[PDB]
């Protein structure tokens, strides 16, 4: 009765909506059916413009009208693609105000809401039924049921004598769809005073599955509903749309999510003669000086290139950076910026961490009594960067639990039957203090550093930041900080965080330069000289150097060269990059070792 009229109304929107000379939804449908994507994304501002009455119904009773807009889409799709196809999914976009995760309460039950959060977990896909074929136990009578996944359905209780519940499902004739579960945590800043962050369970269907990964900020449009698991119901959100700032699909598979128009911008930016300067200036615009550390951070974000030799050996392609220095140097602020610019990043404190917190931990499911594996900081940061602050407060065991994941980029587990070798391809950016809090020049370098040579050799570049009291520099820093406190270039000398992050993603998924012979000869000669320099320094002092120079440093120089080449989308690394890489190595690691 009314259902047919509602279906007719939503069908006329898809067939009559033109903003100029193009039918936006009719053409979107045809283009989607051609690539086998049975869905239509509709913007709710367009529906409020066609007929406000249709929006009033879709917002007053969402779980009753949404199922009738899907069938209208399916009918129009059949009319457009078939010359005389499952039920089509409807994905919604809205610009309504976002309700804070913790402000959702009884006043929003069964209503369309928009909210943001952080995805902390994702489930293994399940299978939900969409068309059952049933039969009767006694008289063997065949029937079918059709189900929409919008709850306010079960097998018939009485046959069509036959006892109660006479119907058994015939599986080889039924059809199913995909279902996923997500946990959404509220943003750290939104949380009220003295409160732990709160979770919320979410479910997505069909083409909204496998769209997010744990640890990524997302925006959700859905229905705040309830399901019975006494007179209380556990709330949850039925997703109707997902929007994210991270192209997770490009990151897991190939290069994707870059439009040709967007791609053209990246090539134009790469063609800039002084992209290195722009990127260096774009990191921490509010921190004065420390240019070398900012260049090192650019190289770390860019990364090197990984090689798999024919015999099977793999060569690490990531760069690890350590910041040792005195208080007030802005190491923690640099780490907090790097966590915010990188596409994937985790900020962790060495004190509030553990060996299982990093890597992976073995957990027991209370229901199935079965042990399973949950990823830690280094798994949650896979393919990105881990910012381990307070690296000196970490316990010896928890620090030792990081060697293999830092070098081999794998997390071997052998616990509770579970036996595996996970993958953790992450870059470590660590900040630490010397033993006495300040780097005391009076005592030998072996007295100011408690890190063992094994852990230190795993860092590509080591920065020993010393705070020297110079009146000119002090006045400059005072002026800069006061300007910050009392007080937008965007004129080719700096790019916002979003653009820089997208450019990092593009470069990582598009380029992997290789060394030319001249660079190889140059780097090889430099390694021989540096090793001789360590030996002359060692012969002079009975004490064995605390900062080592092993083959890992040669590989680190190669990685820095490759990252500098990749920064400009150059398929080959030339001497103009080798010189910069050698300069950075001398400015950080040989500088630390010389003292």
């Amino acid at each position: 009765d009314d259902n047919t009229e509602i279906i007719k109304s939503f069908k006329n929107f898809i067939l009559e909506f033109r903003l100029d000379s193009q039918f936006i939804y009719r053409d979107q449908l045809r283009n989607n059916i051609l690539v086998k994507n049975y869905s239509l994304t509709v913007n709710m501002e367009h529906l409020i413009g066609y007929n406000e009455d249709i929006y009033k119904k879709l917002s007053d009773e969402p779980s009753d009208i949404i199922p009738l807009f899907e069938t209208a889409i399916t009918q129009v799709a059949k009319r457009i693609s078939i010359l005389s196809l499952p039920t089509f999914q409807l994905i919604l976009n809205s610009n309504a105000n976002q309700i804070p995760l913790r402000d959702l309460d009884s006043e929003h039950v069964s209503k369309i809401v928009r909210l943001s959060g952080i995805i902390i977990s994702t489930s293994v896909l399940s299978s939900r039924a969409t068309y059952l074929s049933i039969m009767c136990r006694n008289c063997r009578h065949t029937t079918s049921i059709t189900i929409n996944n919008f709850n306010s359905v079960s097998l018939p209780r009485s046959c069509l004598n036959c006892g109660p519940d006479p119907y058994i499902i015939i599986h080889e004739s039924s059809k199913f769809i995909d279902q996923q579960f997500l946990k959404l945590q509220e943003i750290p800043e939104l949380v009220p005073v003295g409160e732990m962050p709160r979770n919320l369970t979410m479910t997505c269907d069909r083409y909204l599955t496998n769209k997010v990964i744990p640890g990524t900020r997302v925006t959700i449009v859905g229905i705040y509903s309830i399901y019975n698991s006494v007179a209380i119901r556990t709330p949850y959100i039925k997703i109707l749309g997902i929007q994210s700032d991270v192209e997770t699909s490009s990151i897991w598979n190939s290069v994707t999510m870059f439009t040709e128009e967007e791609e053209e911008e990246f090539l134009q930016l790469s063609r800039n003669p002084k992209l290195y300067e722009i990127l260096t200036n774009s990191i921490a615009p509010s921190i004065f000086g420390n240019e070398d550390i900012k260049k090192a951070i650019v190289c770390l974000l860019m990364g090197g290139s990984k090689k798999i030799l024919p015999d099977g050996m793999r060569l690490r392609g990531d760069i690890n950076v350590l910041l040792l220095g005195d208080p007030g140097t802005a190491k923690s602020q640099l780490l907090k910026f790097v966590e915010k610019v990188s596409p994937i990043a985790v900020y962790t404190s060495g004190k509030g961490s553990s060996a299982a917190g990093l890597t992976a931990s073995v957990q027991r499911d209370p229901m199935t009594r079965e042990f399973y594996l949950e990823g830690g900081a280094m798994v949650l940061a896979d393919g990105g960067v881990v910012c381990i602050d307070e690296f000196d407060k970490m316990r010896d065991e928890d620090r030792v639990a990081i060697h293999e994941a830092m070098e081999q980029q794998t997390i071997s587990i052998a616990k509770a039957g579970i036996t595996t070798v996970l993958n953790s391809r992450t870059s470590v950016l660590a900040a630490a203090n010397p033993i006495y809090g300040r780097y005391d020049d009076l005592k030998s370098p072996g007295d100011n550093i408690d890190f063992q040579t094994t852990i230190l050799s795993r860092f590509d570049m080591i920065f020993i930041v010393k705070d020297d009291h110079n009146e000119e520099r002090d006045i400059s820093i005072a002026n800069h900080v006061i300007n910050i406190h009392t007080g937008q270039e965007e004129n080719g000398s700096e790019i916002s965080i979003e653009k820089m992050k997208r450019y990092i993603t593009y470069c990582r998924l598009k380029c992997a330069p290789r060394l030319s012979p001249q660079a190889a000869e140059k780097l090889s000669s430099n390694f021989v000289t540096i090793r001789k320099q360590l030996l002359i320094n060692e012969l002079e002092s009975t004490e064995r150097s605390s900062i080592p120079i092993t083959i890992r440093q040669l590989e680190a120089i190669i990685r820095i060269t490759e990252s500098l080449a990749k920064l400009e989308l150059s398929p080959i690394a030339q001497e103009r990059h080798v010189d910069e890489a050698i300069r950075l190595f001398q400015a950080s690691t040989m500088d630390a070792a010389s003292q």
């Binding site: 199913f176 698991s229 050996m313 036996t419 998924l509 080959i572």
Partner: protein, 618 residues
Amino acid sequence: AVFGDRVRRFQEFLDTFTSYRDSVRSIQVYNSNNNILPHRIIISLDDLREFDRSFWSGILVEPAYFIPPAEKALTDLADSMDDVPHPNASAVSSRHPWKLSFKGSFGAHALSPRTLTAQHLNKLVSVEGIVTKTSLVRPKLIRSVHYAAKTGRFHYRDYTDATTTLTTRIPTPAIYPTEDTEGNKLTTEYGYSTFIDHQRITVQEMPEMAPAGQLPRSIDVILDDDLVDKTKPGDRVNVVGVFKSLGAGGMNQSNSNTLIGFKTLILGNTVYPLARQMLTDFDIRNINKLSKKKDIFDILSQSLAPSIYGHDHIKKAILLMLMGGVEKNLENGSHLRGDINILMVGDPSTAKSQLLRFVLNTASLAIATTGRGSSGVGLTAAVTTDRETGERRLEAGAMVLADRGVVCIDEFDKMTDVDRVAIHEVMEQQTVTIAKAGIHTTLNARCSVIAAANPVFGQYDVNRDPHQNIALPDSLLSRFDLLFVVTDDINEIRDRSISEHVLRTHRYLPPGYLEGEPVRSLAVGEPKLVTIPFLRKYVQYAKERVIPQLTQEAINVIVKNYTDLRNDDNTKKSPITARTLETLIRLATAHAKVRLSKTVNKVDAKVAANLLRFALLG
């Protein structure tokens, strides 16, 4: 109606291709002569596609409606072939139809546990992964036969379940009939009833193929009858079966969730291993021709890890470890092991971990473990409960899973004493004794241990004695055949050579790729460096069909070397002991294996002596 037509169409297919008929006849003949081959046939999906496209498409997309007809046609053919004169009553009552198994090329149905979605339900798929669990084998009732004493006639009943057939039927509780239709007493005849085995395994996605920041997923599989014990945990398999769903999935009013999906799993048809290489006559002749060379040992050793510069002696030791020794157990009870254990201690960045990884990749069986990532229980075995039957059992650990293989332990010095005790016991006795949860047993763990450790101060110190440099107990140290101490000594020529080698290695580009391109099957049935595959074939051949025996000349060499080594003024990085004699004999035997010889000669003794002397006195 349609079923009979399809049975006729499949029967016409089996007639056109005679290989399946010949295989069935050979199976029946072998069974008649007799230990017993199962009633299974492997058909090529390519041949079916060439013969009748509709049948091939149906078997790939609607297996439920097309596989049972083919199985019935095959059974009818086999029955028409059968010529057994006298059938035993069990055979007459037996319910043993012929089962069908597939091979060939699955176009888009070749998937992995991560890519299996609801779109693939009720379809023939092939899945690849690691077997992580394996329930216990329990018989499953299918047919029961009874006897009515008064009436003097036998009756029978047929049972079906959701996992024993592809078409949905009414469930049959396992209650045995007790009274005849007319009220006669019925006595079950178990010897004539039909039970089949049943097992459930879990297949996990390969960890290295997983996405970024996601743990691998798994799927449940069912194997019945002759596919019951073809896999063990830690094996790489390719499973073919039908993807299904079971149960009511919350549609029954008892479950009030309303947000839980249906159960799903695969009924397997075939299992394909992915561990032993099949040797050809050409390969065997090439192996022999190479073995006749006088410098085969050097060639094979250098061929190991071509991208690691230097470390010749460690590579030789790794080769001898891959070959192994000869295991002897005496009548009295003494059980001498023929495995070689190796320990590497050295300064950071000396290629210890890369050598471990190469051994992991080359060896036929190898398990990877670290110091802080493992545990005492995770190395030996764990007590869990079986989901299928709810019975207490043991799950094999890293050491047990690597039986008759190799276990690579990285960061040997970062382990705990409690976890070190388990490895101490395993290396000392080569077995695992378990006393937990009312379980008493002894699992076999006969594996070679290759480990890498760091000195106490992170860098070997020449001044301090070896005891002060290594934190491991002396008792644990005495169980390693060869202790290699490697130091990073800065030199000009050596540094230039190593740097040039590394730079050359870093410039490799794999064929099929352009400069600046970052690095990323078709069927299921299926002084020159020696390639790794040929090295694997050589090792397999040599350690499979060579058992060298000692000879008086090697005996004199070994006794002279031991006598001189023990009472000599020069200090040793490890203390000489009677265990050194066993290590010498083991190394000589392994080198004899390398040459494909049935006897240990002077040359093998002289090679073992030189290797041990390098290990002990640099």
